[PDB]
Amino acid sequence: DPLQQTGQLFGGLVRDIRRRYPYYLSDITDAFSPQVLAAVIFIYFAALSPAITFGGLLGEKTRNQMGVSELLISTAVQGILFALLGAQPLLVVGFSGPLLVFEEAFFSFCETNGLEYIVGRVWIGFWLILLVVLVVAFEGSFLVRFISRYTQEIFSFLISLIFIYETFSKLIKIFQDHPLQKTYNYNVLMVPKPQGPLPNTALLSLVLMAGTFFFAMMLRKFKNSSYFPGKLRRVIGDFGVPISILIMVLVDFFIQDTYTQKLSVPDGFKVSNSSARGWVIHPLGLRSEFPIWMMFASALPALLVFILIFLESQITTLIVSKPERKMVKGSGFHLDLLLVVGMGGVAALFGMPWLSATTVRSVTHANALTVMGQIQEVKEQRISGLLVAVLVGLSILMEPILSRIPLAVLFGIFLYMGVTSLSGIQLFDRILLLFKPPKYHPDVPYVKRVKTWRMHLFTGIQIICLAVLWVVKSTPASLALPFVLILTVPLRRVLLPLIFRNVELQCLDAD
């Protein structure tokens, strides 16, 4: 019903508003639960740490044009606004890898042509605002109807694998920075960072990450396990991630001689490069007048950004708001798209980065708010997102608290997040079934109705698509990764029916 084309202009937006806004008092009053607070802390850490990392990276690639502080402010403000007004408050808006790739590419292009980067970002944001207004006007979001379970599952599996690979690559980098050596230099300098290898740092980081992951898994099992009174067991289980974070933070705190990398938040809310840019960015130019040719040619990068943000946000909303996840309040596609893209453009006007609804963190938020009885229900409320965004904004004032948080603890939390995000995806189920004998296959329609080798061939085609997407991402043509993902949609609709019969597709791919 929400994904339907109507003759009235902006019909999807008003339909989404009329569907969601009646439940506003229900969302406000539904946050009174310990599970909500536990998910608040979990999502706060899982949104601050990637935000810190992406801000540091963005400050590194650019000449500090956009760094940690601007990313934090943008994330906080956009999260507050999206939680307050969005049709699906369970979504969390944050910076993503493809966005960083585009930002570095645009900065390189601007340096090559000598134009101002941030003013180009402002004009791209204006183009994005125009594009999203037109798309919502013409009900373009209905196109996500053609995104079936095939594309959603491929995207979710690839993105979770990317999260796991990023965590493991960070661990490998922390090992390479401090190699296991017989001897090390003494009285090293750590003012910006350790200039040389350090003893016990890599092994302690690995130990902390593994311990955090193990404790998260143990608490997740204990939540379903029947070793304690039901109320106490559920309260401890839903607080599992904060418990693991607290335990590992205390463990690292009680170690005084060894050095482990901690979260670094800036002192005060200010621009990363005060001399380079101000709070408000002039659309005509801070130093040189903006040529009209870029004013009119910003559409193509803006078109690419809109395609990336729209595809990622809408596929993430489709994944989160599936009927199998027991979401009864409904979700709005047009309103969410308008909000995310328009606020991204407005943030680009203020010099802050634009953001899209990330997949791993939104799925993790939904899973944390999911109440298990089989999924009995999902706590859908805006207070969780509002509090997460408020805490992200206030993370600057909480420097003593975040200074004690090791990065390896968050690496373990990210590994756990990716692994549990892998759960619930039938593509992962077929991956597991690839190794099981045909006797042990579960009683599901896509096992009885279809032969085992046909289902294995379907899973092999999905694996081939995943490998192609991974190769594209590793290729410096990473911005084309969404587009080839779009190429998955015709494959299901055109090429797949040539191979598999109608009943095989309807059983294997179904809403």
Add this chain to the structure above:
Amino acid sequence: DPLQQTGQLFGGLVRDIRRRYPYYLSDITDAFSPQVLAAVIFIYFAALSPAITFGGLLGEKTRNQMGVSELLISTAVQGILFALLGAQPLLVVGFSGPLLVFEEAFFSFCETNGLEYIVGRVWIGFWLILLVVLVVAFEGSFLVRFISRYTQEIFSFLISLIFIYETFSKLIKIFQDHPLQKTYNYNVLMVPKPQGPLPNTALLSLVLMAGTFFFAMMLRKFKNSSYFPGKLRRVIGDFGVPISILIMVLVDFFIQDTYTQKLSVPDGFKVSNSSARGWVIHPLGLRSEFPIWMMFASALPALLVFILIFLESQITTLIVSKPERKMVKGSGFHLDLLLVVGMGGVAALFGMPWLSATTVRSVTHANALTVMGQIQEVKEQRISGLLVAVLVGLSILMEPILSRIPLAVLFGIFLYMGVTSLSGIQLFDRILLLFKPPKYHPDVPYVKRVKTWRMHLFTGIQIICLAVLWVVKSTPASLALPFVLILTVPLRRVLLPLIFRNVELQCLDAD
């Protein structure tokens, strides 16, 4: 009933021989299976490493009169003989902690008096031979019929807890030897051992132990899991411990710079202190004449040693040969005791330690040879024990391979061994049930036929007994630890019926 008293002298011995010896060809031919080889490797490592540790300890306490070479030779010879002739080949003989404490105490007493310690040992061995001959003549082993599930369970739980605590204490020791410090000395000497703290050694040892335990658990779960073809999955499951050992050994091998403690085996078969003692020890004395007062007073410490060895070996045989473990070939309670004590006394003649049937290693051997369908059957054969003893004897010739083996890998293997030995003990099941709500209690007679609080009180009484045994063991009066264990037998027979009704005891304690 094999465990009964008959009119004929040496009745138990002849009954056990006439029972077990017919199946000799069956034991010889029953070893043709990959599970047998995997258990051979597992038990070989799990018997060599404790033997090496105990030999090093014995060299430390004594003036190298008793060392690791004598311990290895005695263990190998006695294992070969027991596997060839014993009525329960699945039993593995080895040194134990109580034996260490007695040897240290006897050496201290002999030094304080001033006579030769090893000649006292050989006289103790002669007294042991006389005592075991008399006991088997009078069929004293039937007294273990008084030992019920109560005492066996308490002993097994305490011994498994002791194994786990020893592994964790070893980990704490290797952490304390190399503290996590900001700086370390350089050009450290490691000719006998590291003379100072070393970087990354403690953390790498912890990582190796945790990884070995994790891999062992993952392969143990995979053995019963539904993945992979059944034959291949089972074959990998039996070889789980060797696979974990190999993986961790390779991981440590590929780390050149960092130092981890390895197994240390002697070069050649020779006495630890050539000047102090020879291979054959003269019963009247090597340098100082042996007074007759010790000649006739050696019985009391020899009686203590016989009580310790007999009690440990018989309870271990009771635990291993329980009917619920599906052992159909039979067991020997009189031939096994005679063999163990007689070869212990003969080893005392040849200047080698006496060895008892260790609990954790025998239970581990039985579990490794156990075929799981519920326990379908147990592979009972002599070739496993014979090969384990032969490899222990040949450990000297395999110096490079063992030098490549780290000690943290074996610590993780010991942790896995203790945890797996904890399984199958109903006392541990009631410990787990202490936390579960009454609804989730399993379907066993001691849940319905007895109230929840009565069963909890029974488990609390067993907990108090365990605490008393632990306190006694930590107390320097460790030699009394078996004796107070015997005190559990009257408590079940006399004090317990005062509190619990007959039906409660018959349900909670049953064979």
